[PDB]
Design a protein around this motif. Structure first.
Motif, PDB file in Angstrom:
ATOM      1  N   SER B 142       0.732  -1.236   0.122  1.00 30.35           N
ATOM      2  CA  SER B 142      -0.144  -0.104  -0.137  1.00 30.35           C
ATOM      3  C   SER B 142       0.999   1.323  -0.121  1.00 30.35           C
ATOM      4  CB  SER B 142      -0.878  -0.087   1.374  1.00 30.35           C
ATOM      5  OG  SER B 142      -1.497   1.143   1.328  1.00 30.35           O
ATOM      6  N   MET B 143       0.822   1.966   1.048  1.00 36.12           N
ATOM      7  CA  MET B 143       1.647   3.300   1.246  1.00 36.12           C
ATOM      8  C   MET B 143       3.181   2.739   1.181  1.00 36.12           C
ATOM      9  SD  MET B 143      -0.249   5.761   3.804  1.00 36.12           S
ATOM     10  CE  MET B 143       1.109   6.830   3.555  1.00 36.12           C
ATOM     11  N   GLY B 144       3.451   1.671   1.809  1.00 34.42           N
ATOM     12  CA  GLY B 144       4.593   0.645   1.747  1.00 34.42           C
ATOM     13  C   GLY B 144       5.424   0.848   0.290  1.00 34.42           C
ATOM     14  N   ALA B 145       4.322   0.340  -0.668  1.00 39.16           N
ATOM     15  CA  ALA B 145       4.556   0.443  -2.028  1.00 39.16           C
ATOM     16  C   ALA B 145       4.888   1.700  -2.544  1.00 39.16           C
ATOM     17  CB  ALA B 145       3.614  -0.321  -2.501  1.00 39.16           C
ATOM     18  N   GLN B 146       4.200   2.716  -2.031  1.00 39.96           N
ATOM     19  CA  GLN B 146       4.620   4.109  -2.694  1.00 39.96           C
ATOM     20  C   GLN B 146       5.959   4.549  -2.065  1.00 39.96           C
ATOM     21  OE1 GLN B 146       0.708   6.407  -1.122  1.00 39.96           O
ATOM     22  NE2 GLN B 146       1.059   6.802  -3.343  1.00 39.96           N
ATOM     23  N   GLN B 147       6.404   4.207  -0.972  1.00 43.06           N
ATOM     24  CA  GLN B 147       7.452   4.626  -0.238  1.00 43.06           C
ATOM     25  C   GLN B 147       8.713   3.772  -1.060  1.00 43.06           C
ATOM     26  OE1 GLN B 147       7.753   4.702   4.218  1.00 43.06           O
ATOM     27  NE2 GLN B 147       5.632   4.586   3.805  1.00 43.06           N
ATOM     28  N   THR B 148       8.142   2.441  -1.635  1.00 44.58           N
ATOM     29  CA  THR B 148       9.237   1.709  -2.492  1.00 44.58           C
ATOM     30  C   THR B 148       9.501   2.304  -3.680  1.00 44.58           C
ATOM     31  OG1 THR B 148       8.381  -0.463  -1.151  1.00 44.58           O
ATOM     32  CG2 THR B 148       9.401  -0.674  -3.598  1.00 44.58           C
ATOM     33  N   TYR B 149       8.601   2.795  -4.422  1.00 47.81           N
ATOM     34  CA  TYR B 149       8.519   3.488  -5.562  1.00 47.81           C
ATOM     35  C   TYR B 149       9.636   4.715  -5.425  1.00 47.81           C
ATOM     36  CZ  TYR B 149       5.145   0.741  -8.171  1.00 47.81           C
ATOM     37  OH  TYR B 149       4.711  -0.382  -8.794  1.00 47.81           O
ATOM     38  N   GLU B 150       9.165   5.550  -4.259  1.00 49.75           N
ATOM     39  CA  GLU B 150      10.026   6.709  -4.079  1.00 49.75           C
ATOM     40  C   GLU B 150      11.432   6.253  -3.911  1.00 49.75           C
ATOM     41  OE1 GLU B 150       8.811   9.836  -4.146  1.00 49.75           O
ATOM     42  OE2 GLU B 150      10.780  10.719  -3.492  1.00 49.75           O
ATOM     43  N   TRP B 151      11.507   5.360  -3.150  1.00 51.00           N
ATOM     44  CA  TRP B 151      13.038   4.936  -2.913  1.00 51.00           C
ATOM     45  C   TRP B 151      13.648   4.541  -4.070  1.00 51.00           C
ATOM     46  CZ3 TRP B 151      17.389   3.977   0.091  1.00 51.00           C
ATOM     47  CH2 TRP B 151      17.237   4.337   1.491  1.00 51.00           C
ATOM     48  N   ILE B 152      13.265   3.778  -5.093  1.00 48.78           N
ATOM     49  CA  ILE B 152      14.028   3.379  -6.274  1.00 48.78           C
ATOM     50  C   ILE B 152      13.841   4.427  -7.405  1.00 48.78           C
ATOM     51  CG2 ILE B 152      13.466   0.879  -5.986  1.00 48.78           C
ATOM     52  CD1 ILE B 152      11.160   1.341  -7.751  1.00 48.78           C
ATOM     53  N   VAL B 153      13.367   5.506  -7.331  1.00 49.56           N
ATOM     54  CA  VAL B 153      13.403   6.712  -8.135  1.00 49.56           C
ATOM     55  C   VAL B 153      14.065   7.860  -7.596  1.00 49.56           C
ATOM     56  CG1 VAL B 153      11.997   8.744  -9.068  1.00 49.56           C
ATOM     57  CG2 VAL B 153      11.164   6.077  -8.894  1.00 49.56           C
ATOM     58  N   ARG B 154      14.280   8.064  -6.202  1.00 48.17           N
ATOM     59  CA  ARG B 154      15.096   9.237  -5.541  1.00 48.17           C
ATOM     60  C   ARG B 154      16.546   8.517  -5.426  1.00 48.17           C
ATOM     61  NH1 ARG B 154      14.447  13.456  -1.828  1.00 48.17           N
ATOM     62  NH2 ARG B 154      12.040  13.207  -1.936  1.00 48.17           N
ATOM     63  N   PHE B 155      16.674   7.378  -4.968  1.00 45.79           N
ATOM     64  CA  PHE B 155      18.064   6.801  -4.739  1.00 45.79           C
ATOM     65  C   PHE B 155      18.032   5.567  -5.825  1.00 45.79           C
ATOM     66  CE2 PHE B 155      17.031   8.643  -0.515  1.00 45.79           C
ATOM     67  CZ  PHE B 155      17.743   9.712  -0.614  1.00 45.79           C
ATOM     68  N   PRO B 156      18.256   5.716  -6.919  1.00 41.72           N
ATOM     69  CA  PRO B 156      18.306   4.695  -7.873  1.00 41.72           C
ATOM     70  C   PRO B 156      19.324   3.532  -7.713  1.00 41.72           C
ATOM     71  CG  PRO B 156      18.026   6.797  -9.098  1.00 41.72           C
ATOM     72  CD  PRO B 156      18.314   7.172  -7.703  1.00 41.72           C
ATOM     73  N   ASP B 157      20.689   4.144  -7.269  1.00 36.27           N
ATOM     74  CA  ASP B 157      21.842   3.278  -7.255  1.00 36.27           C
ATOM     75  C   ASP B 157      21.859   2.761  -5.831  1.00 36.27           C
ATOM     76  OD1 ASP B 157      22.521   4.051  -9.947  1.00 36.27           O
ATOM     77  OD2 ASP B 157      23.863   5.473  -9.270  1.00 36.27           O
ATOM     78  N   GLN B 158      20.885   2.783  -4.963  1.00 33.77           N
ATOM     79  CA  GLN B 158      20.965   2.223  -3.410  1.00 33.77           C
ATOM     80  C   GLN B 158      20.062   1.087  -3.256  1.00 33.77           C
ATOM     81  OE1 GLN B 158      21.023   5.133  -0.308  1.00 33.77           O
ATOM     82  NE2 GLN B 158      21.528   6.887  -1.502  1.00 33.77           N
ATOM     83  N   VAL B 159      19.219   0.848  -4.356  1.00 33.10           N
ATOM     84  CA  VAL B 159      18.357  -0.225  -4.352  1.00 33.10           C
ATOM     85  C   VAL B 159      18.700  -1.259  -5.530  1.00 33.10           C
ATOM     86  CG1 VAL B 159      15.913  -1.049  -4.485  1.00 33.10           C
ATOM     87  CG2 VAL B 159      16.606   1.144  -3.259  1.00 33.10           C
ATOM     88  N   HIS B 160      18.722  -2.828  -4.897  1.00 30.74           N
ATOM     89  CA  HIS B 160      18.817  -3.666  -6.063  1.00 30.74           C
ATOM     90  C   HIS B 160      17.672  -4.498  -6.531  1.00 30.74           C
ATOM     91  CE1 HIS B 160      23.253  -3.292  -5.516  1.00 30.74           C
ATOM     92  NE2 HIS B 160      23.174  -3.794  -4.337  1.00 30.74           N
ATOM     93  N   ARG B 161      16.833  -4.339  -5.676  1.00 34.41           N
ATOM     94  CA  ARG B 161      15.425  -5.227  -5.825  1.00 34.41           C
ATOM     95  C   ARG B 161      14.295  -4.345  -5.019  1.00 34.41           C
ATOM     96  NH1 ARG B 161      19.978  -8.562  -4.575  1.00 34.41           N
ATOM     97  NH2 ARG B 161      20.087 -10.062  -6.095  1.00 34.41           N
ATOM     98  N   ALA B 162      13.384  -4.232  -5.925  1.00 31.22           N
ATOM     99  CA  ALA B 162      12.027  -3.784  -5.212  1.00 31.22           C
ATOM    100  C   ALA B 162      10.800  -4.521  -5.386  1.00 31.22           C
ATOM    101  CB  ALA B 162      11.824  -2.385  -5.896  1.00 31.22           C
ATOM    102  N   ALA B 163       9.860  -4.494  -4.386  1.00 34.85           N
ATOM    103  CA  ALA B 163       8.754  -5.438  -4.593  1.00 34.85           C
ATOM    104  C   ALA B 163       7.542  -4.413  -4.023  1.00 34.85           C
ATOM    105  CB  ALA B 163       8.925  -6.636  -3.707  1.00 34.85           C
ATOM    106  N   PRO B 164       6.975  -3.569  -4.934  1.00 36.07           N
ATOM    107  CA  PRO B 164       5.952  -2.716  -4.459  1.00 36.07           C
ATOM    108  C   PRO B 164       4.656  -3.552  -4.611  1.00 36.07           C
ATOM    109  CG  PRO B 164       6.671  -2.358  -6.771  1.00 36.07           C
ATOM    110  CD  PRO B 164       7.722  -3.214  -6.060  1.00 36.07           C
ATOM    111  N   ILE B 165       3.948  -3.835  -3.344  1.00 36.11           N
ATOM    112  CA  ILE B 165       2.746  -4.584  -3.435  1.00 36.11           C
ATOM    113  C   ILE B 165       1.546  -3.904  -3.237  1.00 36.11           C
ATOM    114  CG2 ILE B 165       1.788  -6.532  -2.352  1.00 36.11           C
ATOM    115  CD1 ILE B 165       4.417  -7.613  -1.173  1.00 36.11           C
ATOM    116  N   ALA B 166       0.784  -4.097  -3.939  1.00 35.67           N
ATOM    117  CA  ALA B 166      -0.731  -3.320  -3.845  1.00 35.67           C
ATOM    118  C   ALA B 166      -0.562  -1.834  -3.770  1.00 35.67           C
ATOM    119  CB  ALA B 166      -1.498  -3.990  -2.884  1.00 35.67           C
ATOM    120  N   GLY B 167       0.217  -1.203  -4.632  1.00 39.94           N
ATOM    121  CA  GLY B 167       0.304   0.314  -4.550  1.00 39.94           C
ATOM    122  C   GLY B 167       0.560   1.022  -5.839  1.00 39.94           C
ATOM    123  N   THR B 168       0.502   2.369  -5.834  1.00 41.61           N
ATOM    124  CA  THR B 168       1.061   2.851  -7.194  1.00 41.61           C
ATOM    125  C   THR B 168       2.196   3.956  -6.849  1.00 41.61           C
ATOM    126  OG1 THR B 168      -0.657   4.724  -7.131  1.00 41.61           O
ATOM    127  CG2 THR B 168      -1.264   2.671  -8.585  1.00 41.61           C
TER     128      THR B 168
END
Lengths: 349, 349
Positions: B142-168
């Motif tokens: 949900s909102m955790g997925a939103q933060q997941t998206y924000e993470w991989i967009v704002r700090f692209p080189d700091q995240v290897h894998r992402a799993a945004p579940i039920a969120g845009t």
């Protein structure tokens, strides 16, 4: 008895009101002077066989039908059929909590009316005022579809064709929950005063809240995402609420809404067969076109398709509309064309 | 500063709280003493490369993750990875309106925190307390997925894998409308007192109303129609609300909810690219598995699938669950198995 300019002929269009007398409700209550409000278009033929009945839906009257669905260039042609629309009990135009002369059932003392009570009342009016014993077709939307289902199940031999649009025959638990949230935010308004308010303007906040609840459920995610409200000539998303939906609901009577909402919550044609819905819809003799709206959120196709599979000789005609349930207001370009095409085919057979 | 037994370690499980210092928010506000609440499981390896971050969702903490998702027999294995969950700002456990010692931002004076503010705060905590500069994976619902998206967009080189579940990644207009109705019924409660209440028990009516709003949107029509709540050991449909959902929300802090609700309403990773969402998600370097829930009503697959088509090298793994959005609570039998299967495959690549 209150005064609301919304529930007048000047707004809803011309209509007549006749009384059917004493009406004993299923829930136990009694309406001593039960009078209904109806509007007609077209001429009833010699053998009274071209009559089409149109029940109203929640928070609505006959106005939408006569200004969107009915015309010579439509399937519901007043040149061919005698088209009569009878308003629901307590819908604001017929005998209602906020317009009844009876003090024993005035306002918060108004009894609980079921869908079955409406159909019984409608049959009495049709016979009393026009001598109509058989209907060419029964067409209704939402709660009007519920009354359509009740009609073809309770009086199977009195209906030839049926067109339940965007509605179920037996209310699903999710529909109940959603409708409950609608009632709560209205009752949450202190101005509501337990159903004993002096004006609908006192419950303005609650009515507006319900409006927003309809914006969330009554459309579809794609409707808002694609800004389909632009063809309605509205500037922004917020304008859709503030300049259209909010003024609409704030103009309505809370007691009237709460009454029809309860009726909606207890729609069940399987009451005639002890709960067996399959057995109930098996009674259906009328040619039925189950027509759900594709993006309808609380009356989804799967729910309607499930019921259609129980109605013998029926067909499923899904109406494609991005606007979902509130597509009934004819806010889409291709809505009415689909409605007319299916209804014409229904009227041919 | 108020007292709520719900927001304690005795209920949410063990957790630590560290301060990252002064945090200047994007909306203008400032949190002088910004302290976050986090829970960990597992051991961080020598080169600090097995860290997995789990942001919390709306009205939630870390509790659900540690009691449903995390285990040795799961994908989120604390035997392999250092799994840390950081609570959202104002979520009730971290620095919040109803627990801050700062009088300038206490209760109704608490500033507006964006999703971006959380991710900035989380990165600071991860570096300060553990020296973590890269994450093995970021998983959120949900909102955790939103933060997941924000993470991989704002700090692209700091995240290897992402799993945004039920969120845009970018909040749709319908999500805004729905969330608004949630806030209204809470603010409608007179006990709320404009955010200056003395106890959450005073806003009990508003919290209960929101609970019912979640029952209407947070599940699915089939969830209620098939009575899928029976496997949870609940007697009736009404029992689902009165004995589960209603007690849950009534235990929460209104200001906390309103704060996270606002954050939710303004989720937009395209802020980094002037509005161009395609350009924003183009920045994504992490291996991403967009995992919406099949029957999710306000985070539908089509919305998530649209975003997934903009994320290079990503995959779409739809989770089949009749319970819809609230399936995140693991109320279905086959929910966690699907989650673990996909996450394991993600962790392998």
């Amino acid at each position: 008895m209150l005064d609301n300019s919304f529930y007048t002929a000047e707004v809803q269009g011309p209509y007549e009101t006749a009384s059917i007398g004493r009406l004993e409700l299923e829930e136990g209550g009694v309406i001593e002077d039960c009078w209904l409000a109806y509007a007609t278009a077209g001429t009833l033929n010699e053998d009274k066989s071209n009559a089409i009945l149109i029940p109203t839906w929640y928070s609505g009257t006959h106005q939408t039908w006569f200004q969107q669905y009915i015309g010579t260039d439509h399937a519901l042609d007043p040149s061919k059929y005698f088209i009569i629309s009878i308003n629901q009990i307590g819908n604001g135009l017929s005998v209602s909590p906020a317009n009844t002369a009876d003090d024993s059932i005035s306002m918060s003392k108004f009894p609980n009316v079921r869908i079955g009570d409406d159909v019984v009342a409608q049959d009495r009016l049709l016979r009393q005022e026009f001598g109509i014993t058989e209907l060419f077709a029964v067409v209704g939307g939402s709660m009007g579809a519920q009354q359509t289902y009740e009609w073809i199940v309770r009086f199977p031999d009195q209906v030839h064709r049926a067109a339940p649009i965007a509605g179920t025959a037996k209310n699903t638990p999710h529909d109940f929950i959603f409708t409950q949230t609608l009632n709560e935010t209205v009752e949450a308004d202190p101005g509501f005063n337990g159903g004993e308010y002096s004006s609908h303007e006192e419950v303005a906040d609650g009515l507006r809240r319900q409006s927003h609840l309809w914006a969330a459920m009554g459309f579809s995610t794609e409707f808002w995402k694609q800004e389909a409200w632009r063809r309605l000539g509205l500037e922004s998303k917020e304008s859709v609420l503030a300049d259209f939906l909010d003024p609409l609901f704030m103009s309505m009577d809370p007691n009237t809404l709460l009454n029809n909402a309860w009726k909606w919550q207890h729609g069940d044609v399987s009451r005639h067969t002890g709960g067996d819905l399959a057995a109930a819809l098996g009674r259906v003799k009328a040619k039925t076109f189950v027509m759900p709206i594709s993006e309808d959120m609380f009356f989804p196709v799967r729910d309607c398709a499930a019921e259609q599979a129980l109605i013998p000789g029926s067909e499923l005609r899904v109406i494609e509309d991005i606007a979902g349930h509130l597509g009934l207001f004819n806010v889409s370009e291709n809505y009415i064309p689909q409605i007319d095409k299916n209804l014409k085919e229904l009227f041919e057979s």
